[PDB]
Amino acid sequence: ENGYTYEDYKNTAEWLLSHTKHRPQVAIICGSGLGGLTDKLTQAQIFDYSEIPNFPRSTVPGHAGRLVFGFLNGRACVMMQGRFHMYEGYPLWKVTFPVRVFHLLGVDTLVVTNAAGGLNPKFEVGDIMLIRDHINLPGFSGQNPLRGPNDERFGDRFPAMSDAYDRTMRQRALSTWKQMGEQRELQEGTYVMVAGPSFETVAECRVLQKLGADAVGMSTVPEVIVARHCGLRVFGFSLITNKVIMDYESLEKANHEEVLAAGKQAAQKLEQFVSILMASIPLPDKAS
Amino acid sequence: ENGYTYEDYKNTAEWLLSHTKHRPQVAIICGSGLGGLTDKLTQAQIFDYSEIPNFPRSTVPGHAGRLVFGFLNGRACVMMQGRFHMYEGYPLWKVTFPVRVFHLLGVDTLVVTNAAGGLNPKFEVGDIMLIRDHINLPGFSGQNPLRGPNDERFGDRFPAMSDAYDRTMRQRALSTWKQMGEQRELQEGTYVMVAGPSFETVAECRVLQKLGADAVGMSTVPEVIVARHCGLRVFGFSLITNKVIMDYESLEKANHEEVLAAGKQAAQKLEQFVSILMASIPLPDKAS
Amino acid sequence: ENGYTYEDYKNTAEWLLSHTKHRPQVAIICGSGLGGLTDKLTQAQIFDYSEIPNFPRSTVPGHAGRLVFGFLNGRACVMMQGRFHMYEGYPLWKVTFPVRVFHLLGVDTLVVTNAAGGLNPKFEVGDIMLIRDHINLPGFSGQNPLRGPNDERFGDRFPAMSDAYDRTMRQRALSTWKQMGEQRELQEGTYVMVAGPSFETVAECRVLQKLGADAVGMSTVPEVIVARHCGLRVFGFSLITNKVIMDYESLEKANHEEVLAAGKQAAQKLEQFVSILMASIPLPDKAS
Ligand SMILES: O=c1[nH]c(S)nc2ccccc12
Ligand SMILES: O=c1[nH]c(S)nc2ccccc12
Ligand SMILES: O=c1[nH]c(S)nc2ccccc12
Incomplete structure (x- = not known):
């Protein structure tokens, strides 16, 4: 919703339609250190958010800030390099905003990736984590990317989220992760969106655990509302870029932008995984 | 508080005093599918929120959006058909706003009803649930209908809420529910206000349970702050319009606007119950 | 962040530098009933927030609302009598605002005190509680005193908070509390910041306990983000001004502004403790 009307969104989609060859079927929104995946694109047409009629512009490089329309491995993708976070200041209905254009672009699947701090102890930096559910810690509070009036043009007043994350694709994903036989396990997990940008304290981590969450992070669960x-x-997946300290002790263990191949190998691990998964995305037309 | 001054509230009360025969003693605010209760009114004078000097207008029918002043079964009521939710966009101090007029109207009791998703497993669609306590999930965050400066004209800076929900009336209520000997049990329960409008995911439901809540819903706990x-x-009561899925499995069970007589029989069940309860509301004057 | 630019902060620091003899090393921000500690100051220069270029002014006495620059027991302090709360209406980046001036003032340590409702049962009104960690219940939601863009001039985009509260000083503190051999124990504890001003209901208290918190209060955890x-x-410390009712029963037990010497003896207890602790604050220069 707010700040944007439906025309804005059309205008934005329209401009993008009438400015690109591409009709993307799939949107992907990359998390930090996963932008690299925009390389896998072919016949990339890049846009600076900038140029696009309503798109939130980022907050300064920025140049991690682009929309690249692509072919990933089958599918007509549009990818977002440099997602918006509420910790940066927009509100949700600027985070969730590409998502609503993507639809209008005719996109029908969204994949989201992100980096999260693993809360689940069975979890190791480098791990990918396939999102099964989420906890919307800002949602509970007001902060849900649908707050204000509802545009029946996009969806229902009270969308369900019990099924945000496809059984089918989690199925397909989990298949695939084995089909290529792997490294470690493809994890699966509730991701807690916590806003807002300090990292947690221990007590806080403890809470997100007892609350039930496996990966804590800070994007997704707004794209996902606006998407479902x-x-x-x-x-989507979270790259566990950190084992979240659960526990009292000294100068210790964090974070994402400071591991060797447990940033950039894991990043590519997820990136290829994602690229492969294109193959499981149901082609659109009904299409068998 | 915000956006409204005390004069606004007087002006609104004043206009309503000087525009209606009625001095209501009791305000009732109905939840979805309980507006029907405004039928039980007699010598109904209806107002469109619309006409009333400051009242938030609703967000579009709207025509589920009225203030009907009534006699319910003893008492001089003013009832609200179409409560405001923060998921629609106002802030609390527009939800909580009728409540502050109601007072100024000389109302001294408020009954709130709503539809909530039952979290407590011992709970069944159709169930009424008598609110014993609440958890103010947006309150913890900022979102409390008293945030900003306090008008000692209405209340204290730091009202208590441990006793939001009358022992006496929960007593009386619980009596009465038996006095007319019933169907199922009159339940009792913490209602969690969760903002914000997608329904929860499973993980989320799980949280509200371990958090201790029985009914999850999305109004009340702001009327109640501004009221106490x-x-x-x-x-007040929640109509359980849903057994909240606690649990992983397929295309399943939800929601309120889609049960047969487990919408409209339960609605009337609560509505009469409410009408009867008028009888337990202490008349005002000290009055024995 | 928001609403303020970096110049504002300099201007404010600059005006204060160029308007006072003092260069404070330590800022102290007092909680209710601990303002008295500004007496321990010597060569107090008082400022009304008022006079200070950007400082939020309070919301009305107000006259519990001053910045007194002092010498407490060693150290060059600047103290804040009448902290801002978000329940009053500013946003965090007006609570957290003195803190950012204090830095710019060259302050390098901040001590925060507050009154909190004890949740931990092993806890007794009068108790001081030394803050070991916090739970940032509004932080999880959006409400973190760093939300919007980050000024690398003050800090990192993603400051850690696992170590908000110094091991060293909690060490020193805990030493000292014994070194003067005492009354009861110096407690230690997670403080939950809950926003937002009604007091909790029982169900709510119950939640903050299972969430793990010992003292619940309503300032700190924003000064602390902006500080770390x-x-x-x-x-810092919380004065437990209340044993938070955990439990269902009648007209019972709360709050801070209504105990005899379990307001004002405890207040002085904490105030001296604080004054003594000045002695443990590492002098600044590297300085051995
Ligand atoms: O290690 C982390 N803790 C938290 S709260 N959020 C994160 C987001 C991305 C990467 C790591 C983290
Ligand atoms: O079934 C429900 N889940 C949630 S979160 N809120 C509700 C509000 C009214 C009716 C049902 C529900
Ligand atoms: O007794 C209290 N409960 C809560 S929620 N907050 C407080 C803050 C200061 C003093 C007491 C309290």
Whole structure:
């Protein structure tokens, strides 16, 4: 919703339609250190958010800040390099905003990736984690990317989220992760979106655990509301870039932008995984 | 508080005093599918929120959006058909706003009803649930209908809420529910206000349970702050319109606007119950 | 962040530098009933927030609302009598605002005190509680005193908070509390910041307990983000002004502004403790 009207969104989609060859079927929104995946694109047309009629511009490089329309491995993708976070200041209905254009672009599946701090002890930096559910810690509070009036043009007043994350694709994903036989396990997990940008304290971590969450992070669960709200099929992963300290002790263990190949090998691990998974995305037309 | 001054509230009360025969003693605010209760009114004078000097207008029918002043079964009621939710966009101090007029109207008791998703497993669609306590999930965050400066004219800076929901009336209520010997049990329960409008995911439901809540819903706990803050006697019920899925499995069970007589029989069940309860509301004057 | 630019902060620091003899090393921000500690100051220069270029002014006495620059027991202090709360209406980046001036003033340690409702049953009104960690219940939601863009001039985009509260000083503190051999124990504890001003209901209290918190209160955990974000050394205490009712029963037990010497003896207890602790604050220069 707010700040944007439906025309804004059309205008934005329209400009993008009438400015690119591409009709993307799949949107991907990359988390930090996963932008690299925009390389896998072919016949990339890049846009600076900038140029796009309503798109939030980022907050300064920025140049981690682009929309690249692509072919990833089958599918007509549009990818977002440099997602918006509420910790940066927009509100949700600027985070969730590409998502609503993506739809209008005719996108029907959204994949989201992100980096999260693993809370689940069975979890190791480098791990990918396939999002099964989420906890919307800002949602509970007001902060849900649908707050204000509802545009029946996009969705229902009270979309369900019990099924945000596709059984089918989590199925397919989990298959695939084995089909290529791997490294460690493809984890699966509730991701807690915590806003807002200090990292947690121990007591806080402890809470997110007892609350039940496996990966804590800070994007997703707004793209996902606006996505499921729209009807997109959603799935995604968190790269565990950190084992979240659960526990009292000294100068210790964190974070994402400071591991060797446990940033950039894991990043590519997820990136290829994602690229492969394109193959499981149901082609659109009904299409068998 | 915000956006409204005390004069606004007087002006609104004043206009309503000087525009209606009625001096209501009791305000009732109905939840979805309980507006029907405004039928039980007699010598109904209806107002569109619309006409009333400051009242938030709703967000579009709207025509589920009225203030009907009534006699319910003893008492001089003013009832609200179409409560405001923060998921729609106002802030609390527009939800909580009728409540502060109601006081100024000389109302001294507020009854609130709503539809909530039952979290407590011992709970069944159709169930009424008498609110014993609440958890103010947006309150913890900022979002409390008293945030900003306090008008000692209405209440204290730091009202207590441990006693939001009258022992007396929960007593009386619970009596009465037996006095007419019933169907199922009159349940009792913490209602968690969760903002913000997608329904929860499973993980989320799980959290509200371990958090201790029985009914999850999305109004009340702002009317109740502003009410107790004002001194009104508050009590209320949730119609369980849903057994909240606690648990992983397929295309399943939800929601309120889609049960047969487990919408409209339960609605009337609560509505009569409410009408009867008028009888337990202490008449005002000290009055024995 | 928001609403303020970096110049504002300099201007404010600059005006205060160029308007006072003092260069404070330590900032102290007092909680209710601990303002008295500004008496221990010597060569007090008082400022009304008022006079200070950007400082939020309070919301009305107000006259519990001053910045007194002092010498407490060694150290060059600047103290804040009448902290801002978000329940009053500013946003965090007006609570957290003195803190950022304090830095710019060259302050490098911040001590925060407050009154909290004890949740931990092993806890008794009068108790001081040394803050070991916090739970940032509004932080999880959006409400973190760093939300919006980050000024690398003050800190990192993603400051850690696992170490908000100094091991060293909690060490020193805990030493000292024994060194003067005492009354009861110096407690230690997670403080939950809950926003937002009604007191909790029982169900709510129950939640903050299972969430793990010992003292619930309503300031600190924003000064602390902006402080650690800045690099200040932070530590502090909560005066337990209340044993938070955990439990269902009648007209019972609360609150802070209504105990005899379990307001004002405890206040002085904490105040001296604080004054003594000045002695443990590492002098600044590297300084051995
Ligand atoms: O290690 C982390 N803790 C938290 S709260 N959020 C994160 C987001 C991305 C990477 C790591 C983290
Ligand atoms: O079934 C429900 N889940 C949630 S979160 N809120 C509700 C509000 C009204 C009716 C049902 C529900
Ligand atoms: O007794 C209290 N409960 C809560 S929620 N907050 C407080 C803050 C200061 C003093 C007491 C309290």
